[PDB]
Every structure is written in C-alpha cells, then in structure tokens.
Paper text:
Besides, [name]-[name]-2 VOCs carry mutations at varying frequencies in the [name] that are specific to Alpha, Beta, Gamma, Lambda, and Omicron. where Alpha, Beta, and Gamma have the substitution [name], Lambda has the substitution G15S, and Omicron has the substitution P132H. To elaborate on the impact of the G15S, [name], and P132H mutations on the structure of [name], the apo-form structures of G15S, [name], and P132H were determined at 1.77, 1.66, and 1.82 Å resolution, respectively. There is only one protomer in an asymmetric unit in each crystal structure, and all 1–301 residues could be traced in the electron density map. The mutant residues 15 and 90 are located in domain I and residue 132 is located in domain II. All these mutations are far away from the catalytic pocket; thus, it is reasonable to speculate that the G15S, [name], and P132H mutations do not directly affect the architecture of the catalytic pocket. G15S, [name], and P132H showed merely a slight difference from WT, with average root-mean-square deviation (RMSD) values of only 0.54 Å, 0.52 Å, and 0.58 Å, respectively, indicating that all these three mutations had a limited impact on the apo structure of [name]. The mutation of the amino acid at position 90 from lysine to arginine results in the breaking of a hydrogen bond from lysine to the water molecule but does not significantly alter the conformations of surrounding residues. The catalytic efficiency (kcat/Km) values were determined to be 2.66 × 104 M−1s−1 for G15S, 3.05 × 104 M−1s−1 for [name], 2.64 × 104 M−1s−1 for P132H, respectively, which are comparable to 2.71 × 104 M−1s−1 for WT. It is indicated that the G15S, [name], P132H, and WT have similar enzymatic kinetic parameters and the impact of the three substitutions on [name] could be neglected.
Numbering used by the authors:
A (entry chain A), B (entry chain A): 1 to 300
Write the structure that this text describes.
C-alpha cells in the first residue's frame, strides 16, 4: 500500500540521451537507431529567435556544424533533415542500446515520465500530466531543451514529449517526437501565454478511488448524483466535463472498491462545495488530478 | 523553473535487480559484483515469521535452495552468509553492469530514490524521505521486498535502503544494506507499530526557499524571530527543533534569495499559526517536508 507519484524506470531512455551542439547553443538529443532527434531551435541565435525562418536557417548549415557527443564517443553526423519543430540528424552509428520504441502523441489528461537532462546527462526523473491547456508543469532549467517524456509498456518505450520552451507563467511547452507542438505554441519569441486551465475530473475521481483502496474513506457519503447534476457543479469549479466514457473507464476501480462512479461523484461534489476542512487525502490537502485511472490500477 | 519531487535516474540500479526464490517465497535481490543481497526473511515460512530463529533456519538451507534469476540467465549460488537482516548470496558470476557504489546509512530527514520492483523487474521510481520515526511513506505491494533506495553522486550509487515490511499504518520499514534496521523494527510478526512522527523543519524551510526561487512569495513577511522563539512555536505544532547547524546549512539558499533564515522562520511561524487560507505553495496546500536543502539546490 501507499500511493506515490511514480515515474517509469528511466534506464532504457538514459541510454539514448546525447549532447548536441550547434554554434554556441548546447542541448539534449535523443539517439535512436542512426538518428538523433533534437529541437530545431538548436540552430538559432538569440537574434534569430525573434522571427526565425527555420527553412532558411537550416539550408545554411552543414553536417559538420553539428557536434553530437554520446558520453565520450563523438557521433559523426552524415545528414540532417527537419521534421516540423524537430531536427533529425543522421549519424554514422546506430545506437547499440536502442530500445524497442514508438512515437505516440498523448491527450490532455494523460501522464508520462520526464527524464530531465543537461549536456546530454540525465539528472532526474519525475511524472507529469499533459494539462488541458497543453502545457506541462515540469521542472526544467536552462539547458534542458531536448529532454524527453515517455511511457513504458512491457519492453516498449513510447516517447510522447520533447521539451522546447518555458512560458511566462513558469509552465513548459514542447512537441511530440514527430515535431508537432502540443497546444498553440511556437518555437520563437512571442507574447504567447498558456490559456486558462481546468482540472482533469476523471483523474481526480481515479485518485479518490486510490484513496479508498488505501483505507482513506472519510470523504465518502451515502448520497449519489446524476452525471448531469454532477457536471453542473463541475463546470462551476473549473473542472472538465465527465462523460460516460470516463464512467466506463472508472469501471474496474468502481468494482474493486464497491463504490459506484456517480457515488464517488457525489463525494467529489461535496469536497468541492465544503473544502477539505484541514484534512488530507493520500497526504495531500488539495484534490490531485495528475493520476490517470491506469496510474491508479498500476500502483494499486 | 518549476519544482517537482524528482528521483534519480534509475538505470544504474535497474541493471542490478534480480529475482531470488527460496521455497514458495519470491522477492527481489541486489546483484553487485559476485554477491546478491536480499532480505533474510526470504528463507521463512509464514509459520516461521511468528518467532523465527534465523541462525537455525539458515543452517538448514543449502546453496541449491536459492534460485537466483537475472532476467533469463539463472545465477549459480556458490555460497551464502547472513549479515544482520540481509542475506548475502555469493554467485559464480560477477554482475558485468555493477556500478561504482557504496553502502551508506542515511539520517531521518534525508531523502532517497526508491526503485520499486517485483519478481526482479523494476516497476517505478519515486522519491521518499526517511521519517523522524524511521519509517518511510513508500508505495509497495506484495512482492516488493528487496527493492532498494539509493542516491547518486557523480557516477557513484550510494545504496541506503532495502525494503522489508509494511507496518499496520501502511508505512514501510527496512534496513540499510549492511542489514541493520532503520528504527526499532524487526523482521518477524509482532505488534510493532510506528512511533509518533514529527515534521522535518529544516526541509520545510528549504522548500519555502524553493518557492521563493520560483516566484512564490505571498507567505513572506518583514518580521523576524529568534531561534529560541521559533522553536517554542515549532514544538507546539510537532515540528523538529531547528539548530544552528540547520541555519548554517540553509546559508546558500538564504544568500541566493536574500532572505535571512530567521526571517523565513517568521514566515513559517505565521503559516503554522494562521494556516494557508485556501492558497498554495509550489502546488501544495500543506507544508512539504520531504525536500532537503540539497534537493532544493540541485533542482533550482
């Protein structure tokens, strides 16, 4: 028992992280087979970032303008291509530690593990969720660009995020591994800001089920509610709408605990209306929304 | 920026985890050089656990009574020894992926990363702190015994924890890697329970500094306090005493932010006395005490 925000073991990803330098900019790259993936803004100067034309900037680079370092061994770049906001650097050596992998784009509300790296060297691993406004609340310092987010399934690493930038609110924005941004963000200097966010309701319910599985039951009640009547109170507190699909996904957790989904919804409605009253749930004094139903079943 | 509960990259430890079976019990072992370390209760039946004499139980075992599996490759056990509450199984093959490592015992209040494994297979990684009452609030299911806790320094893995048992409150107890329990717990079935816990004050102050470094300043005030006057209010709320050593350790964080330690203490005193008033600090609605001063400097 116990419930922790838990990341996937990172070893399979650590063996893919390399250092990529272009000019005076150094950041992280992902080395899979004979390709290294990194943010395309590695080719940019601070002056370019104001209004870059990446097609123009890249046609002016040579293979030798990219220094790739895998620990000690330097990787010879034998070609380069742009794919949306990611650069693909073909190197003359296939990474001998390439795991079985896939590039998967995730949905707002789903979680992934982030391996934060600097100069190609992994520093830490932590779990995040893709927010409804397509930002992530990560922990990233200067030099973290190119760090990746991933899930693991059996032996297969599903890469879903590459880090590109920090927004003015301190939240983070990036792309999938095909180079396509999450959300309406761009890799240039603009006034862009995160939109208004909402709470991931299905995740809050999953986490309340985790609490029950762990013997935390004080927030339960005998009342129930309809899906409609719940969603009227959800909207009022900036919660995402709950759908029948979400109810169905919560089925297994409902079965294991014997608490119907709309019964749990009645508990959540009271928690929203009365607050927590100096009590905690699974060690937190607020309603946690960065655990998916899968995360709960996996840990419990 | 951003602040997350962040574990060390686990790859170096994943390569050391193996499966150890004795009789009908299966759990995890740590494979370093030609030795596999695991909880000695692996040799126990449920009847033995009531009042085991481990010296007697082990003299009755042979090398062939221990099945060690490193992924597929089975490890031939060529000798065994007991070291306190850990069993040491000499195997005929030295782990080719043995990292540079040390066995270090930690203090209450310090943190470490836990690699939770099952059947020798890593499942997740998360950060924990050693509580003042020598328990940890982990996330462990049946079969997690033998999972290890560690810190990483440069290239050196400092192992500090092996998981042995769950206490009735759902918290966890284990040993250092020399087999010596943290706290007054034993590896047999008794009425043992965690003692009363306290909050790690120096860590709360470190985390308030993390908040300031990240632009969260609402809890600050212009008031100050003496160490003595702080510690009178600390005791009242079940906080550990703050010492001049703790003030000195917080020096760098005080310098980076320009906020004196006893100034931060005045803010903490007001937070304890008035509560948080529906506001959050670094995304939490309670005072977080599982980040050391080192953890803050490392992430910030």
């Amino acid at each position: 028992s116990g419930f922790r925000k838990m990341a996937f073991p990172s070893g399979k990803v650590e063996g893919c992280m390399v250092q990529v330098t272009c000019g005076t900019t150094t950041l992280n790259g992902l080395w899979l087979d004979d390709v290294v993936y990194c943010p395309r803004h590695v080719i940019c100067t601070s002056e370019d970032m104001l209004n870059p034309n990446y097609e123009d900037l890249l046609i002016r680079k040579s293979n030798h303008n990219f220094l790739v370092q895998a620990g000690n061994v330097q990787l010879r770049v034998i070609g380069h291509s742009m794919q949306n906001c990611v650069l693909k650097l073909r190197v003359d050596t296939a990474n001998p530690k390439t795991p079985k992998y896939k590039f998967v784009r995730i949905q707002p509300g789903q979680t992934f593990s982030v391996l934060a790296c600097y100069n190609g060297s992994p520093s830490g691993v932590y779990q995040c969720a893709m927010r409804p406004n397509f930002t992530i609340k990560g922990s990233f310092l200067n030099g973290s660009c190119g760090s990746v987010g991933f899930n693991i399934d059996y032996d297969c690493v599903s890469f879903c995020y590459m880090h590109h930038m920090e927004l003015p609110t301190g939240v983070h924005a990036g792309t999938d591994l095909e180079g396509n941004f999450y959300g309406p963000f761009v890799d240039r200097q603009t006034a862009q800001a995160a939109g208004t966010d909402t709470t991931i309701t299905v995740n809050v319910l999953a986490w309340l089920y985790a609490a029950v599985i762990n013997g935390d039951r004080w927030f339960l009640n005998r009342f129930t509610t309809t899906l409609n009547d719940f969603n009227l109170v959800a909207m009022k507190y900036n919660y995402e709408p709950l759908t029948q699909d979400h109810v169905d996904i919560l089925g297994p957790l409902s079965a294991q605990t014997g608490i119907a989904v709309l019964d749990m919804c009645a508990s959540l409605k009271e928690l929203l209306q009365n607050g927590m009253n100096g009590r905690t749930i699974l060690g937190s004094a607020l309603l946690e929304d960065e655990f998916t139903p899968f995360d709960v079943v996996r840990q419990c």
